[PDB]
Design a binder for this molecule. Structure first.
Ligand code: HEM
Ligand SMILES: Oc1ccc(Cc2ccc(O)cc2)cc1
Length: 137
């Protein structure tokens, strides 16, 4: 289930972080509005850009922590507040997060693998709720 999936993702985190983010950017190309430096690049080109590798991994490092601290796919209020309050998220709305988790669930649903895609969909919904409750528009 969900806890095992966190262990699976962590076991190959660089590869999952990159592949899931690329799945997001390719499903929702207008999301590059927030990622102007990733425009006009193939997947292989992006995976050779230092900040793409570094930042993607740091994002999924924290995403796996927030998942791990959750109870029944419901994140901590402190983790939602950190996500709303981060200088780097000043732009964003809950729709940006909903799209990331739609892409993550579809990636899991297409993978060869026994991911608990249902639990990740709930986690994305519940994180969106926590973000809205903690002040994200
Ligand atoms: C649970 C989901 C997410 C987590 C854990 C998270 C975490 C992070 C972290 C740790 C950073 C700092 C990266 C660094 O500077 O090395 C970051 C930066 C950023 N995040 Fe998020 N993030 C999440 C979702 C999103 C979403 C959905 C978007 C936009 C659609 C987004 C946009 C950004 C941007 C634009 C930056 C800074 C610019 C950049 O690093 O390229 N984040 N995020
Ligand atoms: O180089 C970066 C890549 C992504 C982000 C935020 C983020 C958003 C969605 C995602 O699936 C992974 C990361 C920040 C910096």
């Amino acid at each position: 289930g969900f806890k095992q999936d966190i262990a699976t993702l962590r076991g190959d985190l660089r590869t999952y972080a990159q592949d899931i983010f690329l799945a997001f950017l390719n499903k929702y190309p207008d999301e590059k509005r927030n990622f102007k430096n990733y425009v006009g690049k193939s997947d292989q080109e992006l995976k050779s850009m230092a900040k793409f590798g570094d930042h993607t991994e740091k994002v999924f490092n924290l995403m796996m922590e927030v998942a791990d601290r959750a109870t029944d796919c419901v994140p901590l209020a402190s983790d939602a507040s950190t996500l709303v309050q981060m200088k780097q998220h000043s732009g964003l709305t809950t729709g940006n997060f909903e799209k990331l988790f739609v892409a993550l669930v579809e990636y899991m649903r297409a993978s060869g693998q026994s991911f608990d895609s249902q639990s990740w969909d709930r986690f994305g919904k519940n994180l969106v709720s926590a973000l809205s409750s903690a002040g994200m528009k």
